[model samples]
Structures are given as structure tokens and as C-alpha cells.
Target: PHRRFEYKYSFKGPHLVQSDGTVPFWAHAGNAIPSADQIRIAPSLKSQRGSVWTKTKAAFENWEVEVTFRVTGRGRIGADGLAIWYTENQGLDGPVFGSADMWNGVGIFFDSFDNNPAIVVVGNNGQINYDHQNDGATQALASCQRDFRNKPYPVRAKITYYQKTLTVMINNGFTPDKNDYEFCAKVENMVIPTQGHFGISAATGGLADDHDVLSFLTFQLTE
Candidate 1:
């Protein structure tokens, strides 16, 4: 059995419409342009929630995900935010950062607006609660500041889970290269599923922004 698995997507045409290798992705709710090089998860609209998920299951215990994305809009601030998720469920849309609520998975939220440009990690155990006022902070295990929206350059996010620990990193570079990430947040003793789908979800409230995913790369540690 292989100990490591790697999947990459450039968000180009054709691949957005279907799965490429282990990178099977689907969009639910909101508007998306899978035919383009950069996939738009949510537009500058109000009260919108959109998501894209991989059909294949990722490694449950150890994995790393790196994504290049950007959020911009015509306002001084933005509401709601985007989420990177690894959960047993997918495609269920709701008020929780564009994904379903009370899910048994790990959520990395890039919350902006009233909450400040922050990154928060939260876990669910079936009875987890989420809402507009929560921002998942009540259940957050770790958090840090990383203004990831309305920037001149693209933002790169790296999320890793290993040794029962979860770590998040972000970079404000035009392109993320080797050894170019800065720590954003981390949590220990966090329990993640053994097998789950990989996905990105985004939502907009009164303040809005254009959420786009330029590329995504995931590495499943087999060792």
C-alpha cells in the first residue's frame, strides 16, 4: 500500500467541469466558473454560500493541503469568509461558512469583517454548533491574524495534519514556492477523521467579496 498520495489542480478549463485523477470536484449553490483557469467560489453578492468538494476521500490521519486563492471586493471590509475543510460529509450547504453545520470534521475558517482578518480552527463531534454570531470561535482550538482578503497579491494557505496536530500557514506572495510559508495557527490533540472529502467553501453576507481559487495541492502522508 502506498504511504503517500498527492493531488493537484490548477483550476483550468475542463478540469473544473470534472475530476482529474484523484481531484474530483463539484460545486454546490452560488455561482462558479469551472471552465476558467481560476475558479470563482462566490461572487460579490449578498447572502450567498458556495462550495466545491473532491469526490475522492483523502487520508484521514496525516495530510497537507496548499491552496492559492484571493478575495476582493468594492468595499472597505468584507463579511463572512472562506473555509477549507476535511470532513466525512460534502455538498451540504448551510450558514456555516458555506458548508453544513454540526459536521464531524475539521474547519479552517478565514473569517473577516467584524471578526477582523483572522484564521480559526474548529472541530466537530456531531453536536457542534454554528451560526452567524459564532464564527466558530466558541469551538475554536487555535486562531491568528492573517488578513487574507482584498490584497494586491494572491494568498497561499498551507494546512497540515500530523501526529494528532493541525497547523496552518499563510503567505502573501504572488506564487507560493518551496520554503516560503509563515505560521498562522496550530492546534494539538485535535481529532480528524480517518477518511474524508477535501473541499473549499465560501459565503457572503451584507458585505461581499469575490472568492476565487486559483490552484489547490494536497499531499497525503503515507508514512
Candidate 2:
């Protein structure tokens, strides 16, 4: 009995980090720096891993999440990428975009640097070791090739899970208009973890970029 599913969590910018350098309801690790404007997950340096995860499991069943983020660097190109996760675990950083191996839920990945797809969505129920070589193409549920790095306006992704379907929309960060999101990927008959946690992570190799998360807003929707 999912009663009155009216949950909204807004981890907005300009105040995400408190005075004591702690996020109130979130946990960050592995070189992640939270500031007044954005949470920097992996700076523009080499061989780095950083992530921010919600301290508690998300309360919604059918949900929509909008993430505002940016990736910028001084390089001609970038290696590695960012990850948006709804998974069974949080904050144990490893290889997969500052997350762990053998995750048991959804992972929306942007870039591989070494490049293909640009954005690949994988719903891994049991597959482990999301390797960098293969780039998870065979494992991908859906994919799109929209380059969103180094944008001035800050890119966004709207991911929703409802009615046995999962969809993702992305903003190109080219418009002054706030309502400029467009289609990225979608899949049907989707099933996710019952008690998943929200997370965002990034990694950098020889070619690096500053991965910053501006905000994470979520809403629980009912039928």
C-alpha cells in the first residue's frame, strides 16, 4: 500500500553544502568537493574518482528525477564520464564512474572518453564488472549520442520510471529557455530495484574534466 506518494527532494545549488562542509541528507566521497554552486565530482585532474549519494533510500516507487550537471575542461577531449545511478548500494567508490562493480540496478552513463554512444542506459540485474573496453553496448537497454560537455548553460536529464516503462530526456544546454528538454532514450517493460538509492558519480583518467552536479530534483508520481 503506497499511500499518498507525494515525495519531492530538491538538492539544489547555491546552498547544497552547509557551513561545516557537509551536505545535510547526502554523503559524498572520493575527492568530491561540495561548494556553494555545484558539487564537483572529479576535478580536471588525472586518475580521480568522486561521487555523491543520498544518505537514505529514495521513498518513491514511480518517480521522476531531473539532474542538472556540467562537464568542462581545458583539454581537446575528455576521458571517462559521469554516471547517474539508482542502485542497491551507495558510496563505495570503485571503477564504474566512481561507483562500484556488480551493482544491482539502473545506471545511466554519459561518455566513455575512449567514445561511443555518448549516453548509454543499462539496467543490470546481475551483470558485474561494467568494463571500459566493451563500453556496455551489448548490455545497454537504450542509447543516444548527444554531446553535452562544456556547455555554458548546464545540461539536464529527466529520467522517469512509470507504467513499466523507463525513459530519459536530455537538454542540450544551448537555450536560455528553461523548458528545452528533448528525447534521449526510452525502454519498455522496465523493472528496477525496490529500495534503490540515488547517486551521481564521475571519473577521470589521463584526459580529465571537471564534472559538476548543480542540482538533483525528484518527484514521486502516482497513477
Candidate 3:
């Protein structure tokens, strides 16, 4: 498998610099908060009901990628949620439904909303309603926030592939050690296979969370 990295933006500053040529876009860096640069949200991710972009061209199929993100801001209304996808297309500019109403391919949503924040797998139908209704084929896992007043928490997430089996991992809060985190879920039939790309996404709705960020740290192609 071959790989290429690109950067497109909607905001500015405090980005995740990578050596692979993957650049960070400044989305929603227009806030008066002093910590805006410390734990701010991307403007393009604000007031959106879906994703930001879909990076297609099938970058990796039997590869694994690890992501690191920071969760900040106040309250929760579905604005702070983010996702990692293995889509059917090269689209990386908007939120696709996770599992229930899943439109194309599959998605692993890090739902950070208040009412129902959880990890989900979006199917080809484009929906987030299949939390666990269909195992192996499609699934979703949920976990609500016990506390949200504290702004700017670190999250370490990973996407691994073993043939048709793909698993997801997540670690929220401050932890430099990767081993301290936890695995979100291990799902099967996540994508249509054959080939695809791996990318990140963030979304917001009513309450704009202007301090959350998604980071891609490291990954490998284990065989």
C-alpha cells in the first residue's frame, strides 16, 4: 500500500506538525479566550451537522494509524464529537452517519456529546443507530461524560487493521504514556475493503466547542 499526506484548512494555529507532509488546518481559531491557542477548536468544525472533508484515494488497507486528540471547551451538545473513517470515497469534508444511518463505507465516531457520547461504527446506509445491534458487521459503543467543566483534555486513539478485522482505541485525559489508555472497540466488516484512505474529522452543532483538536501520532503495517 502507498500513502500520501495533504493539508486543507478553515482556521489557524497550534497545529499537529507531521513529517509525512500531513499539514494541519486552522479551523475556528477566532475566540477571545486566553486558552484559545492552548486548547481551541477549529472554526470549520463549528456549527456543522456532518464532517469536514473525506480523504479518498485509498491510502491504506492493511495498515494501522494512531491518532492523538485534545478535548477542551465547555458543556456539550454534540459539538465536541470527532471521528476516524475508512470511507468508500475520497471525501473528507463532512460528517457521515456512524452505523445507523451510515451512508458510505464505515466510521469510528468519538461522540463527545452530553446526552449520548460514545464510539460508533457507521455502515453504508449512513446512520449512527447501530451501536451494537449488528455485531462484526456493524456496531457502536457508548459512554457518557461524568464531568465536562474541565477544559482541554488529551485523547489518544488508534485504528488498527488485520485483514478484514479493524479495531479502535481511545484514551481521554492527560496521559503521555500510550499504554495507559483503553481500547474503544474491535469491529469487523468496517469498510468495503479493496482499498481506502485513513483520515480525521471533527464536528459541532448547538454549543460550539472551540478547544478540541485531533492529532495523528503514529501507526504501522503489522503482518
Candidate 4:
């Protein structure tokens, strides 16, 4: 079987579900909200955490996901950025990227505010240590240095997982040119659940950034 999910955040559609500000589908932990066209994952505030995820479980073995997001604010540095997740658990707000502390799946972090702008990958038994200040417990499968705060208008991320391998690519200047995507990271011998949910989580410590998700699309692969 194959599956696919796509969202453009038109504000009026059948594919959108938001939390009642308490329950936590786009379940928001702190200040994440669905605005007119984009999902505001986190506002520019201090010591804030927010997250949103799919309501139904996504059961797939091999899949690909492409998301468009932006991180902008009024400061020179942002505390934390955002993370793309695929895990067995749904929502439990904690200290790691506004999601959970220890998860049994994959976490791809887009970190800013610490000058250590890198794309980090963590597996089932790994966690992102906030105190380490340099990659932390999560190792960098690939690294990026694009100033996601200012120069990049709309940052793009594409992730593909197939045959126990995962690949991540990012592009700021999006175009139909297939050569525009720069490889961010790749990892082999990965572990993923057959059925899990896809979500986004973000947080802010002392600094803040307007984390917005413009679009999210998923495709389940098949032979």
C-alpha cells in the first residue's frame, strides 16, 4: 500500500485539524497556531515551546517528506530553531525541541541561535543535549551554515527514507532546477516504525524567532 499527505495551509480545507488551545492535531504546546496560510510553530518570545503533529498515524515503511519553513525575528541570535520528527510517540512537551526528551524514532534538527547552524540527526536511543553547546549528544549526520534568519526567504527541506537509509537535502533558493538542493545529511542502518506520526517542534530559551511552516507534503514509496 501507498500513502500521501499534502497541506498548503489555505486556512479553509478538509485536511486541516487544529487543537482547541488545550487538547494538544496541530496540538500546540505553547504558542503554535495556524495563521492565514502558514502554521506558526513558535512566536518570537522568550522561554517558549510549541509543537504540532498529524492526527492519524502514518503507517509506511519507505517515505519522503518535503517541508517549507522560515525562521525570522528581530534579534541577531535565536535561542533554538525547529525539528522534524517521525516517531512512535505523538506529543509530550519537554526540553528537546519542544517535543520530548528521549524519543524512540528519528529527529532532524535545524538549529540556529547558537552559531552552530547544523542539520543534526538522532536515532531511537539518542537525544539532543541542550547543555553540550556543540552538537550535544546528537551527532551531525550533515551540517549546514545558511543564515536561516535573514538571507533565506523560504527554507526548503526534503527528507527521504528507504531501505534503512535516510537522506536530507536543503535549498533556500527554490526552483525546478534539480541541482539546487544541497545535500545536508545521510545515514544508513536506520530504524523506523511501520506506523508513526509526522510532526514539527520548536522552542526558545532567551532569544526568539518566528518559526513558520508554509507547507508539508509526504509521499509513501512502494515497489
Top-TM-score candidate index: 2
Q: Which stretches of candidate 3 lie over 4 Å from their true place?
A: 1-41, 44-46, 49-56, 76-80, 92-103, 125-153, 189-191, 217-220
Indicate the worst ten consecutive residues by lDDT in candidate 1.
Answer: 1-10
lDDT score for candidate 3 against the true structure? 0.46
Give the clashing pairs for model 4: none
TM per candidate: 0.86, 0.92, 0.62, 0.81
Candidate 4: global Cα-lDDT? 0.70
Superposed model 1: Cα runs more than 4 Å off: 1-5, 8-28, 173-179
Highest lDDT scorer: 2
Cα error, residue 145 of model 1, in Å, equals: 1.1
Candidate 3 per-residue lDDT over residues 1-223, each given as its tens digit: 4422333311223543334423334222122121323323243244643333323344454655555556455544535465566655544343332112333566666656555556665445444433322442334432333222233455666666667777766665555675565666676754554655444555555655543444443343544
Better of 2 and 3 by lDDT: 2
Per-model lDDT: 0.74, 0.81, 0.46, 0.70
Per-residue C-alpha lDDT of model 1 across residues 16-88, encoded as one tens digit per residue: 4544422244444555545445677778888888877876676556888888788887766886788888887
Model 4 C-alpha lDDT per residue in residues 109-153, reported as the tens digit of each score: 888856467677766644533332444544555555655665445
**What's the true lDDT of residue 113 in model 2?**
48
What lDDT tens digits, residue by residue, belong to model 2 across residues 107-197? 8889844545378888878676777447586888998998778777889988888777789999978875556899999989988888778
Mark the 10 consecutive residues where model 2 has the least summed lDDT: 1-10
For candidate 2, the TM-score is 0.92
- What's the TM for model 1? 0.86
Q: Candidate 2 or 3, higher TM-score?
A: 2
